[PDB]
Motif scaffolding. Structure first.
Motif, PDB file in Angstrom:
ATOM      1  N   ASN A 180       0.889  -1.000   0.080  1.00 49.60           N
ATOM      2  CA  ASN A 180      -0.042   0.012  -0.117  1.00 49.60           C
ATOM      3  C   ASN A 180       0.940   1.221  -0.155  1.00 49.60           C
ATOM      4  OD1 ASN A 180       0.473   1.169   3.043  1.00 49.60           O
ATOM      5  ND2 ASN A 180       0.024  -1.200   3.078  1.00 49.60           N
ATOM      6  N   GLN A 181       0.414   2.317  -0.476  1.00 49.06           N
ATOM      7  CA  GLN A 181       1.071   3.434  -0.624  1.00 49.06           C
ATOM      8  C   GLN A 181       2.009   3.736   0.362  1.00 49.06           C
ATOM      9  OE1 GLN A 181      -0.462   6.415  -3.305  1.00 49.06           O
ATOM     10  NE2 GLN A 181      -0.013   8.226  -1.875  1.00 49.06           N
ATOM     11  N   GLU A 182       1.318   3.960   1.661  1.00 47.78           N
ATOM     12  CA  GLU A 182       2.001   4.520   2.765  1.00 47.78           C
ATOM     13  C   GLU A 182       3.087   3.805   3.468  1.00 47.78           C
ATOM     14  OE1 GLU A 182      -0.620   5.705   6.550  1.00 47.78           O
ATOM     15  OE2 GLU A 182       0.889   4.542   7.507  1.00 47.78           O
ATOM     16  N   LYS A 183       2.933   2.253   3.372  1.00 49.69           N
ATOM     17  CA  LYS A 183       4.000   1.465   3.670  1.00 49.69           C
ATOM     18  C   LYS A 183       5.029   0.877   2.826  1.00 49.69           C
ATOM     19  CE  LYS A 183       1.792   0.375   8.087  1.00 49.69           C
ATOM     20  N   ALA A 184       4.738   1.354   1.537  1.00 47.04           N
ATOM     21  CA  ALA A 184       5.625   0.788   0.378  1.00 47.04           C
ATOM     22  C   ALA A 184       7.040   1.176   0.535  1.00 47.04           C
ATOM     23  CB  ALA A 184       5.263   0.986  -1.062  1.00 47.04           C
ATOM     24  N   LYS A 185       8.140   0.178   0.490  1.00 43.05           N
ATOM     25  CA  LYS A 185       9.415   0.486   0.219  1.00 43.05           C
ATOM     26  C   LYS A 185       9.537   0.149  -1.664  1.00 43.05           C
ATOM     27  CE  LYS A 185      12.736   0.238   2.861  1.00 43.05           C
ATOM     28  NZ  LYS A 185      13.813  -0.139   3.877  1.00 43.05           N
ATOM     29  N   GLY A 186      10.542  -0.420  -2.026  1.00 39.89           N
ATOM     30  CA  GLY A 186      10.652  -0.893  -3.541  1.00 39.89           C
ATOM     31  C   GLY A 186      10.375   0.733  -4.445  1.00 39.89           C
ATOM     32  N   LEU A 187      10.388   0.115  -5.880  1.00 39.58           N
ATOM     33  CA  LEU A 187       9.946   1.257  -6.655  1.00 39.58           C
ATOM     34  C   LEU A 187       8.762   2.113  -6.428  1.00 39.58           C
ATOM     35  CD1 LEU A 187      11.225   2.795  -9.135  1.00 39.58           C
ATOM     36  CD2 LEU A 187      10.259   0.987 -10.553  1.00 39.58           C
ATOM     37  N   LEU A 188       7.523   1.275  -5.854  1.00 45.84           N
ATOM     38  CA  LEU A 188       6.406   2.073  -5.660  1.00 45.84           C
ATOM     39  C   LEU A 188       6.622   2.984  -4.612  1.00 45.84           C
ATOM     40  CD1 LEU A 188       3.792  -1.034  -5.925  1.00 45.84           C
ATOM     41  CD2 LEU A 188       4.048   1.381  -7.593  1.00 45.84           C
ATOM     42  N   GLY A 189       7.482   2.472  -3.363  1.00 45.88           N
ATOM     43  CA  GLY A 189       7.937   3.474  -2.408  1.00 45.88           C
ATOM     44  C   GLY A 189       8.802   4.583  -2.902  1.00 45.88           C
ATOM     45  N   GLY A 190       9.734   4.495  -3.949  1.00 39.34           N
ATOM     46  CA  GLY A 190      10.463   5.344  -4.559  1.00 39.34           C
ATOM     47  C   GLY A 190       9.558   6.432  -5.245  1.00 39.34           C
ATOM     48  N   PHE A 191       8.343   6.038  -6.140  1.00 39.59           N
ATOM     49  CA  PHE A 191       7.475   6.794  -6.878  1.00 39.59           C
ATOM     50  C   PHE A 191       6.852   7.702  -5.644  1.00 39.59           C
ATOM     51  CE2 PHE A 191       6.126   4.711 -10.985  1.00 39.59           C
ATOM     52  CZ  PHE A 191       7.360   4.388 -11.416  1.00 39.59           C
ATOM     53  N   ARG A 192       6.732   7.196  -4.522  1.00 35.83           N
ATOM     54  CA  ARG A 192       6.019   7.899  -3.488  1.00 35.83           C
ATOM     55  C   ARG A 192       7.043   8.832  -2.899  1.00 35.83           C
ATOM     56  NH1 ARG A 192       5.846   4.638   0.815  1.00 35.83           N
ATOM     57  NH2 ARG A 192       7.787   6.099   1.441  1.00 35.83           N
ATOM     58  N   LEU A 193       8.262   8.647  -2.861  1.00 34.81           N
ATOM     59  CA  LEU A 193       9.253   9.733  -2.515  1.00 34.81           C
ATOM     60  C   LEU A 193       9.073  10.659  -3.606  1.00 34.81           C
ATOM     61  CD1 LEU A 193      12.450   7.430  -1.181  1.00 34.81           C
ATOM     62  CD2 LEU A 193      10.482   8.705   0.296  1.00 34.81           C
ATOM     63  N   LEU A 194       9.106  10.290  -4.807  1.00 40.28           N
ATOM     64  CA  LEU A 194       9.191  11.440  -5.824  1.00 40.28           C
ATOM     65  C   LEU A 194       7.658  12.161  -5.636  1.00 40.28           C
ATOM     66  CD1 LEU A 194      10.777   9.482  -8.946  1.00 40.28           C
ATOM     67  CD2 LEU A 194      11.699  11.271  -7.311  1.00 40.28           C
ATOM     68  N   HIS A 195       6.582  11.499  -5.591  1.00 39.32           N
ATOM     69  CA  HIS A 195       5.397  12.249  -5.187  1.00 39.32           C
ATOM     70  C   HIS A 195       5.394  13.256  -4.193  1.00 39.32           C
ATOM     71  CE1 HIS A 195       1.331  12.688  -4.396  1.00 39.32           C
ATOM     72  NE2 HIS A 195       1.099  12.072  -3.301  1.00 39.32           N
ATOM     73  N   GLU A 196       6.252  12.881  -3.244  1.00 37.26           N
ATOM     74  CA  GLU A 196       6.339  13.868  -1.762  1.00 37.26           C
ATOM     75  C   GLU A 196       7.141  15.052  -2.333  1.00 37.26           C
ATOM     76  OE1 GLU A 196       7.442  10.811   0.989  1.00 37.26           O
ATOM     77  OE2 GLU A 196       5.371  10.307   1.113  1.00 37.26           O
ATOM     78  N   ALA A 197       8.012  15.035  -3.054  1.00 40.35           N
ATOM     79  CA  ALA A 197       8.951  16.281  -3.426  1.00 40.35           C
ATOM     80  C   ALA A 197       8.336  16.847  -4.360  1.00 40.35           C
ATOM     81  CB  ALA A 197      10.312  15.475  -3.936  1.00 40.35           C
ATOM     82  N   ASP A 198       7.247  16.399  -4.996  1.00 42.72           N
ATOM     83  CA  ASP A 198       6.648  17.055  -6.535  1.00 42.72           C
ATOM     84  C   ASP A 198       5.418  16.766  -6.598  1.00 42.72           C
ATOM     85  OD1 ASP A 198       6.090  18.158  -8.876  1.00 42.72           O
ATOM     86  OD2 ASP A 198       7.687  17.249  -9.985  1.00 42.72           O
ATOM     87  N   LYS A 199       4.355  17.542  -6.276  1.00 40.36           N
ATOM     88  CA  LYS A 199       2.849  17.499  -6.164  1.00 40.36           C
ATOM     89  C   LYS A 199       2.355  17.255  -7.760  1.00 40.36           C
ATOM     90  CE  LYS A 199       0.686  21.857  -5.853  1.00 40.36           C
ATOM     91  NZ  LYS A 199       1.415  22.914  -6.265  1.00 40.36           N
ATOM     92  N   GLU A 200       3.134  17.889  -8.858  1.00 43.08           N
ATOM     93  CA  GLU A 200       2.739  17.901 -10.170  1.00 43.08           C
ATOM     94  C   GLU A 200       3.017  16.490 -10.791  1.00 43.08           C
ATOM     95  OE1 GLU A 200       0.401  20.095 -10.809  1.00 43.08           O
ATOM     96  OE2 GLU A 200       0.917  21.708  -9.282  1.00 43.08           O
ATOM     97  N   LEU A 201       4.137  15.746 -10.360  1.00 42.82           N
ATOM     98  CA  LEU A 201       4.186  14.581 -10.957  1.00 42.82           C
ATOM     99  C   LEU A 201       3.067  13.464 -11.095  1.00 42.82           C
ATOM    100  CD1 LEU A 201       6.483  12.850 -12.375  1.00 42.82           C
ATOM    101  CD2 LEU A 201       7.499  12.079 -10.093  1.00 42.82           C
ATOM    102  N   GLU A 202       2.927  12.815 -12.228  1.00 43.82           N
ATOM    103  CA  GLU A 202       1.692  11.969 -12.444  1.00 43.82           C
ATOM    104  C   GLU A 202       2.274  10.377 -12.251  1.00 43.82           C
ATOM    105  OE1 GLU A 202      -0.323  12.866 -15.798  1.00 43.82           O
ATOM    106  OE2 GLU A 202      -1.043  14.735 -15.224  1.00 43.82           O
ATOM    107  N   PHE A 203       1.541   9.511 -12.117  1.00 43.98           N
ATOM    108  CA  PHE A 203       2.006   7.943 -11.903  1.00 43.98           C
ATOM    109  C   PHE A 203       1.026   7.100 -12.684  1.00 43.98           C
ATOM    110  CE2 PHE A 203       3.580  10.298  -8.192  1.00 43.98           C
ATOM    111  CZ  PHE A 203       4.759  10.051  -8.468  1.00 43.98           C
ATOM    112  N   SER A 204       1.389   6.391 -13.605  1.00 48.61           N
ATOM    113  CA  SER A 204       0.712   5.418 -14.324  1.00 48.61           C
ATOM    114  C   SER A 204       1.104   4.042 -13.837  1.00 48.61           C
ATOM    115  CB  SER A 204       0.765   5.845 -15.834  1.00 48.61           C
ATOM    116  OG  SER A 204      -0.179   4.924 -16.420  1.00 48.61           O
TER     117      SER A 204
END
Length: 515
Positions: A180-204
């Motif tokens: 799940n998003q809150e607890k992920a590490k791995g690449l999905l956790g990495g996507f979350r770190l970029l999400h947190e640095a940049d609110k305009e970034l989109e994820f598919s």
């Protein structure tokens, strides 16, 4: 002295040690890789050898640049100690994308989600994966209750890993706990770190891809399976609210692809599935894209009209791999143009785009064209073009089994190119290789008289020209296959071809285009 590459693998700091300084060059020694001679070797070169040079550009125009990020590119067992040097991984750090003051891509596409029940890809149809992720209670339940449901097929790489995913220490927790998003590490956790640095970034999420399209035809025909599939989308989008797009990269409805079940009904069936996903009213899902071949015959077979009639909003036109070994003729692999009578380079972005817009009446703005972070090569190759500097590429090869590559035979990746094949700073080839611009295709290739290896690749020059094509033709934009390969030079060129004003300048691209 270079702003693009390191002369020695700088390694990777993990748990307060750096165990892989020079690891790339130790592999080369162990395997006897020598760039100016080797025609038949794998390099295993890690992306660590490249310097990170993504600029950022104003990206609020009517185009978008998308990134396929693969969840296997993070690996490299050389990172951990000194034991393994006869093989390696790409070691692609998700954090190379964490630029100041903007983003190199509007949208990151997680590659790839697989499907429960897919026995072409997996001996148990991914059932053990389903159990590990906590979406099935045992393997029988996975198949009996969840056939057609999407899940990442690499839970380590998706939700557990630290290395190259932005985390710095091992922590307890299994994949079920972290899916799940809150607890992920791995690449999905990495996507979350970029999400947190940049609110305009989109994820598919991209579901399928070349090796995982074996189950689509069967799913799309069947009410029950389509319903499981829609449930798969709802579940993933609930677990990861930051996602807003879906790429269903079925390669390809109505044709063979990698060796899949297929039917003339596939495109029409896929359109029912698209509508069914739309009807679920998943609040965060804003758009669905699909894959299309660049071969007009395969486009015809896909029933693209049915898919657009069901509300698809993007087409990722898979404009790469145009050079396939087998027929003894050299070819560009991702070229914009070709002469219509060309039997060497048989496909082009322009032929495919023209076909979609003119014959299938697709809205140009829906179309995204690809640029490539890797090459398609043949050893034992002969260039037959009379005046290579002025005429279309023609050429042949004999035995190209086991041709030079990075991680798989016949494919070099971008890091190898800039470190050992082309010196974009000096404007010339390295190690006995010479760069040729083909003015008919508007594509470059590399060739060594000494090794007889032909290399078809994208360059800053061609990617810039693809950006130019997108703008001239009013297309949706571009995607990179795959973005983990790029150190930033390719993607910079895309933005510059779109005529984007630079925001944050890390490198001056000017001398890398060579006219």
């Amino acid at each position: 002295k270079s702003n693009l590459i390191y002369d020695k693998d700088p390694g990777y700091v993990w748990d307060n040690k750096n165990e892989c300084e020079g690891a790339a060059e130790e592999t080369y020694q162990e395997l006897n890789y020598e760039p100016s001679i080797s025609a038949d070797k794998l390099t295993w070169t890690p992306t660590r050898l490249a310097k990170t040079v993504f600029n950022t550009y104003e990206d609020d125009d009517d185009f978008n640049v998308l990134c396929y990020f693969t969840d296997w590119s993070q690996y490299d067992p050389r990172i951990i100690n000194k034991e393994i040097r006869d093989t390696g991984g790409r070691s692609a750090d998700i954090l190379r994308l964490n630029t100041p003051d903007g983003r190199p891509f509007k949208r990151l596409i997680y590659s790839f989600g697989g499907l429960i029940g897919d026995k072409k890809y997996s001996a148990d149809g991914n059932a053990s994966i389903a159990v590990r992720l906590g979406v099935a209670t045992d393997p029988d339940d996975a198949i009996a209750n969840h056939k057609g449901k999407t899940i990442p097929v690499d839970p380590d790489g998706a939700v557990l890993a630290s290395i190259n995913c932005g985390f710095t220490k091992w922590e307890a927790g299994d994949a079920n706990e972290r899916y799940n998003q809150e607890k992920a590490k791995g690449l999905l956790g990495g996507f979350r770190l970029l999400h947190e640095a940049d609110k305009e970034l989109e994820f598919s999420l991209s579901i399928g891809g070349w090796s995982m399209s074996g189950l689509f035809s069967e799913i799309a025909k069947d009410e029950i399976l389509r319903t499981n599939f829609v449930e798969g989308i709802k579940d993933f989008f609930q677990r990861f609210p930051m996602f807003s797009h879906l790429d269903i990269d079925w390669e390809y409805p109505g044709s063979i692809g990698a060796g899949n079940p297929n039917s003339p009904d596939d495109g029409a069936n896929f359109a029912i599935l698209i509508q069914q996903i739309t009807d679920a009213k998943i609040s965060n899902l804003k758009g669905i894209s699909i894959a299309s071949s660049a071969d007009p015959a395969k486009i015809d077979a896909a029933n693209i009209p049915a898919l657009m009639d069901a509300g698809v909003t993007g087409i990722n036109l898979m404009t790469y791999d145009f050079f396939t070994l087998g027929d003894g003729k050299l070819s560009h692999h991702t070229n914009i143009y070709r002469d219509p009578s060309d039997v060497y380079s048989k496909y082009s972005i322009d032929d495919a785009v023209t076909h979609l817009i003119d014959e299938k009446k697709v809205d140009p703005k829906a179309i995204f064209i690809g640029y490539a972070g890797y090459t398609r090569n043949a050893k034992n190759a002969t260039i037959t073009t009379s005046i290579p500097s002025e005429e279309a590429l023609k050429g042949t090869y004999t035995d190209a089994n086991q041709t030079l590559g990075s991680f798989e035979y016949s494919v070099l990746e971008w890091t190898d190119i800039i470190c050992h094949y082309m010196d974009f700073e000096k404007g010339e080839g390295r190690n006995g290789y010479k760069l040729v611009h083909d003015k008919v295709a508007k594509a470059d290739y590399l060739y060594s008289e000494a090794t007889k290896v032909f290399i078809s690749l994208d360059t800053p020059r061609s990617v810039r020209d693809k950006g130019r094509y997108v703008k001239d033709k009013g297309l949706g934009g571009l995607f990179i296959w795959s973005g983990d390969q790029d150190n930033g030079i390719l993607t910079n060129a895309a933005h510059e071809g779109l005529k984007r004003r630079i925001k944050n300048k890390v490198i001056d691209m000017t001398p890398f285009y060579l006219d």
